[PDB]
């Protein structure tokens with residue numbers, strides 16, 4: 001008889017339900033804990049799964065170390081397991097593929113195999129609004145990218161350069177961080193100045209003078225609120241009934257409302273020209289199946305483009321200033337190139353003259369090598385994927401993670417990779433360039449291979465379309481900083497370590513530098 005054992009099964013179950021509440025809470029904790037450990041052990045036997053990083057707390061996984069020190073985590077895993085490994089992250093399984101083959105695996109993955117919008121829509125849809133970027137099918141995103149790129153032409157950059165320059169000068173004139181007409185030296189926190197200079201310059205050029213004027217008002221606080229809603233927390237908790245989440249949603253409505261008002265106002269007056277991204281999207285935002293973007297979708301798209309451009313660029317110019325603050329030799333070299341190309345400062349800066357400043361562009365290029373603003377990009381796996389030349393299968397429901405910024409910092413691809421050296425890019429100062437064959441996913445021909453160890457703008461269908469804008473903006477900005485100021489660290493201070501916990505990787509604050517006018521007597525005109 002085994003029937004009597006099946007009775008004690010039922011009996012055991014009943015005694016289980018009658019345990020003292022202290023013992024039940026205890027078990028409510030210890031049972032998932034034990035089961036988690038046993039599951040990992042069994043998992044480690046499968047030869048069709050990449051090794052999985054061991055973790056103690058269920059669901060949470062390796063969340064804490066990935067959040068604080070993602071590259072140190074990757075290096076340690078790479079040492080133990082090689083280039084492919086998985087780890088658990090707040091309920092998700094992330095399969096990391098390091099190095100250029102990882103780039104190809106993920107960036108050039110078939111559209112059916114992986115989804116960016118499934119990975120990202122929570123990080124962005126609550127902030128930007130509905131119907132755009134990741135809150136739409138991939139083919140809509142492809143065309144949105146085509147639309148936005150339409151305002152990012154050489155001719156647009158030629159007209160943006162003096163607008164960006166004017167904002168930089170105005171910021172030197174009026175901001176309390178500078179006041180160059182009143183002060184000849186001062187101390188700044190670059191994580192205060194660079195986000196402000198970035199939003200002022202990006203607004204003026206992409207959004208136009210009206211939207212720029214708005215930032216001189218209490219309206220600016222809405223950008224602050226919307227900005228605070230752009231946080232890694234959204235990855236897990238995109239909506240919680242806290243005040244944080246409420247100021248964000250309000251801001252999105254208020255800011256999209258303001259863009260819609262401008263859009264409808266311009267159409268009303270037949271005042272649609274070729275000034276900015278707004279004019280461009282009004283004139284050119286009809287999908288190929290004949291559907292037009294709504295005014296709300298246009299406004300939402302504007303928010304997304306400005307927000308993304310805001311954080312990558314601000315972080316980058318902050319890093320440029322910080323690396324140059326201990327490199328007066330590089331400031332000196334950059335200054336000589338400015339003197340040569342602009343004829344001792346007699347020539348006004350133009351987009352065409354920016355292209356003749358290779359060391360300036362190499363400085364941007366080198367900063368983006370050492371400080372990729374996005375340490376990890378990922379996709380949700382939609383169909384089981386076989387890893388070439390292995391036995392691994394990444395099942396649907398997993399996420400794949402790629403990290404070009406990690407490869408940027410490997411000695412094998414960049415000798416002395418932790419040394420800042422703009423000259424590693426001599427005669428190679430282009431922001432990026434296709435090393436051969438090209439393809440077009442709907443927003444223009446881009447490189448077909450994504451095997452370059454240097455990939456600051458990613459690749460494949462989700463590739464950045466902002467790189468020439470970012471270089472234009474960063475170039476104007478740094479050209480003027482260099483011609484106007486010298487700067488250095490307070491005694492004993494040096495380049496800060498990256499903070500990886502925000503949406504882009506920023507310098508750990510407070511990152512202060514001391515500036516000095518190259519020409520103490522130089523005045524900036526205009527009224528204030």
Ligand SMILES: CC[C@@H](C)n1ncn(-c2ccc(N3CCN(c4ccc(OC[C@H]5CO[C@](Cn6cncn6)(c6ccc(Cl)cc6Cl)O5)cc4)CC3)cc2)c1=O
Nearest residue numbers: 063064067120232233235304305308309312374376377503
């Ligand atoms: C346990 C709780 C707590 C301790 N914890 N523990 C771990 N974590 C955690 C770890 C990591 C992360 N991640 C989430 C993902 N993230 C990130 C990934 C991709 C990314 O952007 C890629 C896409 C989407 O956004 C943009 C960014 N961009 C690109 N160019 C310019 N910006 C983007 C593309 C297009 C447009 Cl229009 C806008 C935007 Cl924003 O590209 C941004 C951040 C890094 C941090 C979040 C939380 C926690 O919160």
Ligand code: HEM
Nearest residue numbers: 308309312313377456457458461462463464465466469470
């Ligand atoms: C230094 C500056 C920047 C860097 C390093 C950068 C980096 C990137 C990267 C790595 C991606 C690919 C993301 C992925 O594959 O998951 C991307 C995508 C994108 N970026 Fe940028 N970016 C920068 C600036 C900008 C700017 C200024 C804009 C807008 C003006 C912009 C708009 C976009 C857009 C529209 C995409 C496409 C998103 C998609 O197709 O899924 N970026 N960027």
